[PDB]
Amino acid sequence: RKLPSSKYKGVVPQPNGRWGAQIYEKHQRVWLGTFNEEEEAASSYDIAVRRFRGRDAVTNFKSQVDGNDAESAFLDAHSKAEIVDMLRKHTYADEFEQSRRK
DNA sequence: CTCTGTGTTGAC
DNA sequence: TCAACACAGAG
Numbered sequence: 001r002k003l004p005s006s007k008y009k010g011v012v013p014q015p016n017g018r019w020g021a022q023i024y025e026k027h028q029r030v031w032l033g034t035f036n037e038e039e040e041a042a043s044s045y046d047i048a049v050r051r052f053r054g055r056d057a058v059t060n061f062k063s064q065v066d067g068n069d070a071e072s073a074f075l076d077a078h079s080k081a082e083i084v085d086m087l088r089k090h091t092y093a094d095e096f097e098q099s100r101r102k
Numbered sequence: 103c104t105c106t107g108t109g110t111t112g113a114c
Numbered sequence: 115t116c117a118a119c120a121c122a123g124a125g
Contacts, residue, residue, distance in 0.1 A: 016105070024115055031107055041122080092116065 006038055008060040010045030021034040021087070023048045044087045051075040051083045074099050 003013035012020045019041040021032035035041045042060040049057050086092040
């Protein structure tokens with residue numbers, strides 16, 4: 001009945017078998033949403049930590065070796081709140097697509 | 103009604 | 115900074 005833990009950083013079990021994501025900023029936990037797939041929570045955490053802590057931060061799936069790309073552009077052109085809301089609303093990929101329609 | 107995500111606590 | 119766990123209260 002104890003919930004399963006995640007290999008990945010910032011990912012927690014949700015009681016229904018789903019997964020939640022969270023980033024810590026100072027003393028405060030910032031919820032990043034809930035997700036059906038553990039990998040999806042992990043990816044959301046990666047996006048959030050690149051926006052909160054920069055291109056050289058430790059990710060679940062990301063390189064650390066790409067300093068200046070379109071993702072850094074899209075993240076820098078948006079507030080922290082807007083990225084968190086995109087992740088919680090599952091709209092990040094769509095917004096990034098329409099952004100680089102430029 | 104369902105079930106997120108906040109409150110809280112304790113390791114590190 | 116971080117997650118584990120219970121369950122207030124958001125939707």
